[PDB]
Amino acid sequence: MENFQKVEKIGEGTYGVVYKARNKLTGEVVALKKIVPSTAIREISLLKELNHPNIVKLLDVIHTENKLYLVFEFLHQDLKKFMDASALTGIPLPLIKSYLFQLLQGLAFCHSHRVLHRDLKPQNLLINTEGAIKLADFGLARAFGVPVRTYTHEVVTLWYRAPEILLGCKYYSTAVDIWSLGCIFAEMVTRRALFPGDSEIDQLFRIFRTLGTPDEVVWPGVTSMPDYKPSFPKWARQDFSKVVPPLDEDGRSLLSQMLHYDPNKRISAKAALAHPFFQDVTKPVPHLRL
Numbered sequence: 001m002e003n004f005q006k007v008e009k010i011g012e013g014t015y016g017v018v019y020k021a022r023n024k025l026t027g028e029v030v031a032l033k034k035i036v037p038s039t040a041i042r043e044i045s046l047l048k049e050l051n052h053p054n055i056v057k058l059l060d061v062i063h064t065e066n067k068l069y070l071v072f073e074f075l076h077q078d079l080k081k082f083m084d085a086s087a088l089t090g091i092p093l094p095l096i097k098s099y100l101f102q103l104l105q106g107l108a109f110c111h112s113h114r115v116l117h118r119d120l121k122p123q124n125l126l127i128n129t130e131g132a133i134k135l136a137d138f139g140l141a142r143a144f145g146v147p148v149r150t151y152t153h154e155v156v157t158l159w160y161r162a163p164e165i166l167l168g169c170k171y172y173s174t175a176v177d178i179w180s181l182g183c184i185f186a187e188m189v190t191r192r193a194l195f196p197g198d199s200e201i202d203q204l205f206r207i208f209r210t211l212g213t214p215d216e217v218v219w220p221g222v223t224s225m226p227d228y229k230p231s232f233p234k235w236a237r238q239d240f241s242k243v244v245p246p247l248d249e250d251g252r253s254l255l256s257q258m259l260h261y262d263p264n265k266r267i268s269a270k271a272a273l274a275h276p277f278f279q280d281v282t283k284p285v286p287h288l289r290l
């Protein structure tokens with residue numbers, strides 16, 4: 001830490017506080033996260049080689065006196081803040097599409113190396129002035145554990161959690177990050193979270209009320225999951241024309257496949273990049289005021 005000057009406190013999250021800092025020798029402006037168990041050091045160290053332009057770069061790992069400091073590339077804004085700033089107008093569709101496309105490329109890269117994010121959400125999607133968007137904190141949930149409250153006792157967002165996780169599947173796949181991104185895609189288009197649950201049962205029941213209570217027809221094996229109960233109410237599925245209205249039929253087809261109940265059938269990131277929705281994809285630059 002003596003090599004870094006804390007410029008400001010950016011925020012705090014699940015695992016610790018994040019500061020904007022300046023490297024006192026390289027001159028570099030970085031984001032410093034102050035979070036050590038053996039398995040986590042090893043796991044965090046492999047993240048250093050998972051480099052991709054749509055993944056926030058992990059520059060260095062500082063393990064000192066029982067404390068762990070992760071040094072990241074710094075981006076000027078997160079997607080929650082961008083959404084809140086664009087609320088009156090909504091993010092134009094071409095930027096939504098470009099962002100979704102780029103995040104899918106990030107996901108196909110990590111997923112092809114068998115690494116899952118596990119906790120995608122707007123705060124973990126960072127943007128710059130050029131039109132790029134990157135996934136932040138990739139791999140940290142597996143490296144450290146995912147607590148019900150943050151280190152600041154603040155609540156864990158359930159809004160983007162895939163239903164297999166909520167139903168108690170222990171070994172879920174890379175399909176959980178596709179569910180999350182699907183949820184974030186719907187939220188960019190409508191300017192409202194898709195499933196804002198405020199407890200596990202609330203989250204699950206918000207899914208069931210839009211997508212229909214899953215059964216053995218749509219998801220073979222669902223009724224035998226750990227937290228599955230035969231007493232769950234039976235709600236009908238709703239039309240995506242009603243769920244994300246402005247979106248065209250390519251968008252709606254892609255989103256429903258990203259929200260498939262059965263994780264084995266949900267589209268993978270690589271097939272999603274070939275969907276017809278991305279046929280006219282471009283890379284606009286956002287209106288960003290730093």
Ligand SMILES: Nc1ncnc2c1ncn2[C@@H]1O[C@H](COP(=O)(O)OP(=O)(O)OP(=O)(O)O)[C@@H](O)[C@H]1O
Nearest residue numbers: 010011012013014015018031072073074075078123
């Ligand atoms: N590399 C980074 N560059 C710039 N700002 C960042 C960076 N990483 C995190 N921040 C921002 O700082 C704030 C704190 O992030 P942090 O990761 O602690 O919590 P979170 O993303 O909301 O939750 P989680 O801890 O589960 O990731 C968030 O708004 C995040 O957007």
Ligand SMILES: [Mg+2]
Nearest residue numbers: 123124136137
């Ligand atoms: Mg984060």
